[PDB]
């Protein structure tokens, strides 16, 4: 039984970058729905229901053929948004090991940002832009809908351990930005939680 | 080169069903961008640039590998939205041979509406819900992002001649309905142009 996590901050804690109205709807309506549908799909699968959502999405091919898609979509949605909320915070600073790794793997922070922005803006339709750790190297990848790199290349077209990510489904930015996804992407730099990103980069698991 | 077609009515002609602000943005920003992106990719393809968009999406497999996805997405977007605007109109009535065909193929108008509503709601992520004519029979199907049944089954996962369609990308309904897509789908019944659908059904292609 998956529980919708509470946000680690107020709905307007990311203002003036991400709007409070969207933060509320995004959490209480969209995430709520993924949790509901994932839970409904796992009702007849107690063997899989006890696994953490992050582990479940790595075992999608282990599910009954008729449960793969519904759980890929909703367990993926739950896993992705849970990471999203924790990966957002104002006032942090990229530094330490993670900053060194980005400069090492991308040449510079600006280099990395340009590549991330490209992935985020070029994601056609619904999806996510990610900064992942593929073994020893950091990389920028994107996925469609609620797919996660944790699902593997065969399913998601991407792979690696997510360090941080940006939701580019239109519901994530339409109320305030409408079609202006690039403005939303720029604002993201102001709220991406480098402290949590650093924590994940340290864990690597 | 492609050009953004003018709407067949004022931006507020679909009120109180589809909001005027969305009609404006959807047309002048979203549709415009597909036209812009398609033209940019076709600049270097004089042998394809002269083709009507509806014809171009039937030959995506003929394009250079590096041009297939960008044109599938943008030429698809242009073709889809062009159909969409003409497929909307207030005050129409589903009747004639189209209605009889719907009743024959789905058992009843209400049965058809339920199936269309289901397909429209079940399209996960960005996409379209379609009423298509194939094998001389009407059927409900959905496609991802800007894919069209006219692109064929291999690419779009669907086939047939579109009679009418509903855009379920979040930008099409978020301003007024937010996450409540089913409500948006219900309102669609109030603006779906049965006259144009009937004309398309008559022509058969
Ligand atoms: Mn989201
Ligand atoms: Mn659209």
From Swiss-Prot, chains A, B:
Organism: Escherichia coli (strain K12)
GO biological process, one term: removal of superoxide radicals
Gene Ontology cellular component annotations, sorted alphabetically: cytoplasm; cytosol
Similarity comment: family membership: Belongs to the iron/manganese superoxide dismutase family.
Required cofactor(s): Mn(2+)
Catalytic activity, as annotated: 2 superoxide + 2 H(+) = H2O2 + O2
Protein name: Superoxide dismutase [Mn]
Function: Destroys superoxide anion radicals which are normally produced within the cells and which are toxic to biological systems.
Keyword set, alphabetical order: Manganese, Metal-binding, Oxidoreductase
Residues at which Mn(2+) binds: 26, 81, 167, 171
């Amino acid at each position: 039984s998956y529980t919708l996590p509470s946000l680690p901050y107020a709905y307007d804690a990311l203002e003036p970058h991400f709007d409070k109205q969207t933060m509320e709807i995004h959490h209480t309506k969209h995430h709520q729905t993924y949790v509901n549908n994932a839970n409904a799909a796992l009702e007849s699968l107690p063997e899989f229901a006890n696994l953490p959502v992050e582990e479940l999405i790595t075992k999608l091919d282990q599910l009954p053929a008729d449960k793969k898609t519904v759980l890929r979509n909703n367990a993926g949605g739950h896993a992705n948004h849970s990471l999203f909320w924790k990966g957002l915070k104002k006032g942090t600073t990229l530094q330490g090991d993670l900053k060194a790794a980005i400069e090492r793997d991308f040449g510079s922070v600006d280099n990395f940002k340009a590549e991330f922005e490209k992935a985020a803006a070029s994601r056609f339709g619904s999806g996510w832009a990610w900064l992942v750790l593929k073994g020893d190297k950091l990389a920028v990848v994107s996925t469609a809908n609620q797919d996660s790199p944790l699902m593997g290349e065969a399913i998601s077209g991407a792979s690696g351990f997510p360090i941080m990510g940006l939701d580019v489904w239109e519901h994530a930015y339409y109320l305030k930005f409408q079609n202006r996804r690039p403005d939303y992407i720029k604002e993201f730099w102001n709220v991406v939680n480098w402290d949590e990103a650093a924590a994940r980069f340290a864990a690597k698991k």
